[PDB]
Design a protein around this ligand. Structure first.
Ligand code: NDP
Ligand code: ZN
Lengths: 129, 342, 115, 96, 209, 87, 145
């Protein structure tokens, strides 16, 4: 139905040599994927709804001039977004970075009722509003 | 180590290597190159100068911003030396001329200046000092160059017990005044070798080799006190060496027999020019003086560098003198000269 | 999934063929690019760099990837042949100014924090 | 106030002063370490404590729109002087 | 009026463009996948890659379509989708002045047929994509690198490629030439954490699962 | 010396492939430790692990022996042979 | 003295009181010349002659897996059981209990702060300790500026 001289190719993609990443950056660097935990200073939620990948932090020395934050690894302030973790891990393997996986932690739904603020015998009765 | 001296980075321009050099007299030949290796790794060199900073702009590219601080220094001033080396951990002495200036006598630039350098440095508290002096330096050599260099070495070693004296042999590399010397010898008629120059052996070194050796001696922990000697891998007799460089330049070779006193007369004639004489009497008393072998002196490969043969890197140095007839020719057209080995 | 579209080569054999005359062209090129560009490289140490770069991507086994390396080397060949490239870019393969990098773990520990 | 370092350098309003060894002082030889004398720490202290008699006081920093955003400081605590966070003038009740 | 700040809404152009979208969807059902018109009256056609030449030709040649101007040609790398790269063709009509957009998808390796013949302006644009995203184009007349420096590597607009690149160049007197060195910044790019954790537009909310 | 210094057992939690060793330490472990109180019989139980046994003797040499589906008497024997070889 | 890396500089693993093994990622590089705590040990061994087999983080994690298979499985409590045989295992000595009342080393919020090296190094820890010790009016920090 889509005849274009199709060929079964079982082994996974090795686009590594195509990407141009240097050997030690494609080998030594370890990237982890995760859902970023929300800033506890905020109650907003729509920042833990994506799968972001980031790389291990490297040396950060202070230059002699003003004590700036000169670094050497270019892939330090590089974070990639992904809808589902499967896409992220596929990208990681096909690129060739050693990857680490953390499962999407989500808040457990707790039973909440205002009638618990008052009680006849339960300890849950509040003492101030 | 001082809290601002811990090594940091990855050897690039902004890497903090932990070296605070001084490279006295870095505005010339190897001074250009050593700063490179000091600037490339990342180190706040304090290169002083006496000429116009114009002849120092070529040091600006070879260093990230905030490095290679330039300071004015005067030879006959202990205060200038103190200002330049007040805040340093290594002081590198490369100050040395080849022609006798009518104002600066040969010995001052080779013992009095190095002696003052060593004294003020040791008073300041610099960890390591590396003084440079010709390998052929002998107390009673016929050329006053080597004699003065020998007394300077002994004076510096007396003043600075742990100074790392370097004895380089004749050095080549771009602006060399040794390869270009014999290369331009055609300009002054046929090449006037003393007694046709069949009796002088030479052991040249590539400048990058000696500069890298200086850098390692800085990084080497045991380099204090010792005295290194910088020799090339192979050694040529003078006649075949001139043959090789002329063939590389493809300029016709017309060797000219000459008595020693006749070349002395020619050197005295050339010493009267008022700027950068092409040759001197002392230069004549140097060229025919073959470089001795000093096996008991720790050589160059012990530091870690590998000596680069002259044949590999003669193309770049002799390339300019090639005319357009063979300006497009490669190295392999010239077979390496018949080295007289051990 | 496993089925995919080729670029030119059908099987490892034909891509293996394409890299063959790519190395052919590089061999016949190296001497006269040394001559033309006034390279400080020598002929032998020109050829072995080509050999080592060809051996660098030894692990590749996907066909399409092999067509990609061969066409990129083809672009490299055009860039070199008609003097669009410059001598500095030719030297770029040879790492002169790049200081030697240690390999053993002990030297890595001595230098600084890095895997 | 600006004071000299033990080496001799002029300390800054932040307190920066290169130490004895502190190889990064060659930058200042044949030059000067530029320091501003008009220290903001003390140029606000000698200003008189305003004695405006009301519970809550407005402050824009003077100049109206040219000043800082209008803040309402509270002249309530008897044991100290209220001050606008932006400018720094100390406001106090006229001894109640 | 009542809405002096909100942009004017032109529903007539919207309906007319939707009618032409149904037209083009019916004409070429082989390659067309999904046609839709944006709120601001801009129609986009999502086609299968094999239709790069046919659909464009139908848009370039048909009497009732009459689009002969390649406004621009662009790729938009997005690593999430299975075929990361998506190519956008922007066409403008002269007899029926309007802007149409056709969008196709490809991964790093699966080639996408080069238009060039349909629009000879695409050529240089075409090269850019290959030199900027890695999307190779089948039988392109000359797919050499176009924008980046000589002997470059990678494809910078790929979202995985770092902002600062990998290697700079500078003078070296030791070799008397400009040399390429691994990256060593004097001050690292501070990556600010914008995009506040509070939902902005309820209309475009992603459905749950 | 070469006598074994610690004996480590890695048994899966519930999977039947590691069932036998689980029975072993269930009944044939307390007296085993009573026999050699000094000897560290470590049981680093985990999930989805093949039942494996490490034996560290001295100088940092370790011996590997699997216990895949090993019966209680069989794991008893594969411990007794190692323990008897106090060298 | 062999300087090491703090818990915010290394990339090693820790274990909670319930047995779950969690991982701490590297936030800031170790100060000065100090390296990680396992890298220095391995380099020490290589210099001394008895070189350890593992060279990067993944290999040392694999070796620790070889030692214990629970200490690699991250963020999940490895089901611990076999309590009854442990009860029957000790139950031999008597070691009669002393009459000394049980007093935990920490008895009041003042001693909750000054426990470890990190806490002792801190100054704000000392500020809050002295806040707790004497009284209320000792640590007032102007919050408006
Ligand atoms: N083949 C060789 O060149 C060999 C050289 N050496 C030794 O190397 C040293 C340096 O050689 P090279 O760099 O080629 O020499 P150059 O004359 O080319 O450069 C000398 C350097 O020192 C400075 N300098 C020289 N004389 C004086 C002076 N009287 N007062 C102040 N500064 C001075 C120069 O700056 P400025 O130009 O402003 O004076 C320049 O920085 C000398 O001691 C030499 O004997 C040893 C063995 C072989
Ligand atoms: Zn104010």
């Amino acid at each position: 139905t889509q005849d274009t001289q199709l060929i079964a190719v079982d082994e996974k993609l090795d686009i590594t040599t195509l990407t141009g990443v240097p050997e030690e950056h494609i080998k030594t660097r370890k990237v982890r994927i995760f859902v970023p935990a929300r800033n506890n200073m905020q109650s907003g939620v729509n920042n833990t709804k994506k799968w972001k990948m980031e790389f291990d932090t490297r040396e950060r020395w202070e230059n002699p001039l003003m004590g700036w934050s000169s670094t050497a690894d270019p892939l330090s302030n590089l974070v990639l977004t992904f809808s589902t973790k499967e896409d992220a891990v596929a990208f990681a393997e096909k690129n060739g970075w050693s990857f680490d996986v953390e499962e999407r932690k989500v808040p457990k739904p707790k039973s909440k009722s205002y009638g618990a603020n008052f009680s006849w015998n339960k300890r849950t009765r509040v003492s101030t509003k | 180590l001082h809290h601002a001296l811990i090594p940091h980075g990855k050897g690039g321009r902004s890497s903090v290597s932990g070296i605070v050099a001084t490279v006295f007299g870095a505005t010339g030949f190897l001074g250009r190159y050593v700063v490179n290796h000091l600037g490339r790794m990342g180190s706040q060199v304090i290169v002083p100068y006496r000429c116009e900073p114009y002849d120092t702009m070529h040091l600006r590219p070879m260093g990230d911003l905030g490095q290679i601080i330039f300071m004015e220094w005067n030879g006959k001033d202990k205060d200038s030396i103190r200002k330049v080396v007040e805040h340093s951990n290594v002081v590198i002495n490369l100050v040395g001329r080849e022609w006798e200036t009518k104002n600066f006598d040969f010995e001052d630039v080779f013992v009095k200046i190095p002696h003052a350098i060593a004294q003020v440095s040791k008073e300041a508290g610099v960890e390591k000092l590396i003084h440079i002096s010709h390998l052929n330096a002998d107390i009673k050599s016929p050329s006053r160059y080597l004699r003065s260099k020998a007394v300077g070495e002994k004076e510096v070693r007396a003043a600075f017990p742990e100074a790392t004296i370097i004895k380089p042999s004749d050095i080549f590399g771009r602006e060399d005044r040794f390869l270009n010397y014999f290369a331009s010898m055609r300009w002054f008629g046929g090449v006037p070798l003393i007694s046709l120059g069949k009796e002088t052996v030479k052991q040249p070194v590539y400048i990058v080799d000696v500069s890298k050796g200086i850098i390692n001696a800085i990084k080497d922990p045991d380099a204090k006190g010792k005295t290194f000697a910088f020799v090339g891998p192979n050694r040529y007799l003078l006649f075949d060496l001139v043959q090789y460089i002329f063939a590389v330049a493809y300029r016709p070779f017309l060797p000219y027999p000459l008595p020693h006193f006749a070349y002395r007369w020619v050197g005295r004639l050339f010493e009267v020019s008022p700027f950068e004489p092409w040759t001197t009497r002392d230069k004549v008393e140097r060229v025919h003086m073959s470089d001795m072998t000093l096996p008991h002196l720790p050589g160059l490969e012990d530091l870690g560098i590998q000596a680069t043969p002259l044949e590999l890197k003669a193309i770049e140095v002799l390339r300019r003198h090639r005319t357009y007839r063979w300006l497009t020719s490669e190295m392999e057209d010239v077979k390496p000269a018949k080295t007289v080995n051990i | 999934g496993t089925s995919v579209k080729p670029i030119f080569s059908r099987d490892m054999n034909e891509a293996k063929r394409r890299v063959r005359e790519l190395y052919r062209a590089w061999y016949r090129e190296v001497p006269n690019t040394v001559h033309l560009f006034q390279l400080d490289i020598s002929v032998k140490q020109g050829r072995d760099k080509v050999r080592e770069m060809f051996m660098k991507n030894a692990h590749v086994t996907d066909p399409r990837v092999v067509d990609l390396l061969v066409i990129k080397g083809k672009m490299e060949l055009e860039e070199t042949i008609n003097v669009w490239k410059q001598r500095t870019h030719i030297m770029r393969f040879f790492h002169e100014t790049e200081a030697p990098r240690p390999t053993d773990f002990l030297s890595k520990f001595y230098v600084g924090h890095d895997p | 106030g600006v004071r000299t370092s033990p080496t001799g350098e002029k300390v800054t309003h932040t307190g920066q002063a290169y130490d004895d060894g502190d190889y990064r002082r060659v930058r200042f030889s044949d030059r000067q370490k530029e320091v501003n004398e008009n220290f903001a720490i003390d140029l606000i202290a000698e200003q008189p404590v305003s004695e405006v008699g009301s519970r809550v006081i407005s402050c824009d920093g003077g100049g109206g729109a040219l000043g800082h955003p209008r803040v309402y400081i509270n002249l309530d605590k008897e044991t100290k002087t209220g001050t606008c966070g932006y400018c720094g003038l100390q406001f106090r009740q006229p001894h109640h | 009026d009542t809405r002096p700040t909100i942009r004017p809404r032109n529903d007539v152009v919207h309906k007319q463009l939707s009618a032409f979208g149904q037209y083009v969807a019916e004409i070429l059902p082989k390659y067309v996948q999904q046609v839709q018109v944006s709120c601001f009256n801009e129609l986009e056609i999502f086609i299968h890659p094999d239709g790069v030449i046919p659909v464009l030709t139908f848009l370039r040649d048909h009497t009732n379509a009459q689009f002969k101007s390649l406004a621009d040609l662009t790729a938009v790398d997005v690593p999430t989708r299975q075929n990361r790269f998506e190519i956008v063709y922007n066409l403008l009509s002269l007899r029926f002045n309007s802007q149409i957009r056709v969008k196709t998808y490809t991964d790093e390796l699966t080639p996408i047929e080069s238009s060039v013949t349909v629009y000879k302006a695409a050529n240089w644009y075409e090269r850019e994509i290959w030199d900027m995203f890695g999307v190779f184009f089948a039988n392109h007349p000359d797919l050499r690198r176009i924008l980046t420096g000589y002997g470059f590597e990678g494809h910078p607009f790929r979202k995985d490629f770092p902002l600062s690149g990998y290697v700079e160049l500078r003078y070296d007197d030791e070799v008397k030439r400009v040399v390429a060195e691994p990256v060593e910044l004097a001050q690292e790019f501070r990556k600010f954490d914008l995009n506040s954790p509070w939902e902005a537009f309820p209309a475009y909310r992603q459905p749950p699962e | 010396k070469l006598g074994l210094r610690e004996i480590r057992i890695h048994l899966c939690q519930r999977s039947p492939g590691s069932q036998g060793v689980r029975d072993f330490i269930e009944k044939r472990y307390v007296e085993l430790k009573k026999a050699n109180p000094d000897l560290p019989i470590l049981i680093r139980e985990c999930s989805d692990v093949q039942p494996k046994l490490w034996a560290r003797y001295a100088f940092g040499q370790e011996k590997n022996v699997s216990l895949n589906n090993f019966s209680a008497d069989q794991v008893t024997r594969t411990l007794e042979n190692v323990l008897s070889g106090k060298a | 003295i062999l300087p090491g890396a703090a818990y915010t500089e290394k990339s090693a693993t820790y274990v909670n009181t319930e047995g779950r093994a969690q991982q701490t990622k590297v936030a800031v590089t170790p100060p000065g010349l100090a390296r990680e705590d396992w890298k220095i040990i391995r380099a020490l061994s290589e210099i001394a002659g008895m070189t350890l087999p593992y060279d990067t983080l993944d290999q040392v994690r694999s070796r620790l897996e070889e030692v214990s298979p629970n200490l690699v499985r991250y963020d999940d409590v490895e089901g611990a059981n076999y309590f009854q045989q442990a009860n029957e295992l000790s139950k031999l000595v008597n070691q009669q209990l002393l009459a000394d009342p049980l007093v935990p080393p920490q008895l009041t919020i003042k001693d909750f702060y000054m426990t470890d090296s990190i806490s002792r190094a801190s100054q704000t820890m000392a500020k809050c300790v002295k806040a707790v010790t004497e009284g209320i009016q000792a640590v007032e920090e102007p919050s408006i500026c």
